[PDB]
UniProtKB/TrEMBL annotation:
Parent-protein residues present: 1684 to 2119 of 3427
Cell compartments where the protein resides: Host cytoplasm, Host perinuclear region; Host endoplasmic reticulum membrane; Host nucleus; Secreted
Name of the protein in question: Genome polyprotein
Residue span(s) of domain Helicase C-terminal: 162-327
Organism: Bagaza virus
Function per UniProt: Functions as a signal peptide for NS4B and is required for the interferon antagonism activity of the latter.
Signal peptide: none
Domain Helicase ATP-binding: start-end pairs: 1-151
Amino acid sequence: LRKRQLTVLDLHPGSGKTRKVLPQIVKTAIDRRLRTAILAPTRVVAAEIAEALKEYPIRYLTPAVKREHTGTEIIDVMCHATLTSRLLTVPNYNLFVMDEAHFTDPASIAARGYISTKVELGEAAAIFMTATPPGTRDPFPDSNSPIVDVEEQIPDRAWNSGYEWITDYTGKTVWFVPSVKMGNEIAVCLTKAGKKVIQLNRKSFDSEYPKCKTGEWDFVITTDISEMGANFGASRVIDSRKCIKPVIIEDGEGSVQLNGPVPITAASAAQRRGRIGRSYVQVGDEYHFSGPTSEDDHDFAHWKEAKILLDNINLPNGLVAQLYEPEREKVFSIDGEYRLRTEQRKNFVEFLRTGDLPVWLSYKLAEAGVAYHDRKWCFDGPSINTVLEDNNPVELWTKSGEKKILRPRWRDGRLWADHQALKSFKDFACGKR
């Protein structure tokens, strides 16, 4: 009960989290009438926490709905981003428990800032659970069983020769890639070599990660989303230590671009490696990697985007929350700099929630006075912002009846990162939501 005292913020890692630790915390919170928020990084982990807590009365919260049996529940389970979303449109929780608290999704960073600030104000206690606390930099941490770390060349595309070590192995392998496209090229190569392959990414995770529990697979090819609580029962990880992440370019109008494979942080590398080595009775787990790690992640867009979110959340004291202490050095702006005026903020929240637009773009739109329903901005950008599909400009029928080339006022590369993103953006440009 040492961790449940107001003004306490506790970090810890381990193994035994949902069978015992989380239920004990929840049991004590209920006995003490502590209004509690349990925060999971993903819908999968929220589900697994909710199942671990099946013996207790809990409320499940999404950004839009609540699931309860009586309405008298005091323990809420939700995704990190659901807290941030509801703060932008919320109980004065006495206790926060954040699982996988290293997640650098902007809404997760902002949630840690809000929670950290509530703790420092003496309004709450918080527990951050993660094997790689924000601020840490150790890519080869200790493990339950020794890991064989092997630095060697890793394919970044299909191969027609060599790499015998990849396909001759008969255990299960988790292979982290920087992009879904690269993962698919590798997955097809492995499949034509007689391997059973599952591909995991943010869009496929809810349907495909559950298939890993059947054990009917040889390889999981995954993006970095599997750094947030995925449990594989594998024996090998392959990791070129790359990611592709948005970068805000502050020159001119400003823009966001997706910068090609760049090195991951040491904490990310430790989380990728940390998929294995988890069991004393399974020895010989291997981590095959190439490339350095890098802590120059200040240029990744999620830090500024977290600050934009936090600057637009009101506090009881009339001020604004700060980022969680070890993360404050990632952003170089003065607190409150991104706070939007009244009508702008209303449109901001709508672009985020109903529009499903990235934080940076939603801020630029809102700040420029764009109304949520006004789609002129999708078509009134300069010709350099023309969106291409199959090297042809995208032409759309607008809600006003005109056929126009898709030319957003600001370029945010996440709007056309893949076919599904582009389709969603085309639907938005046409007024479909």
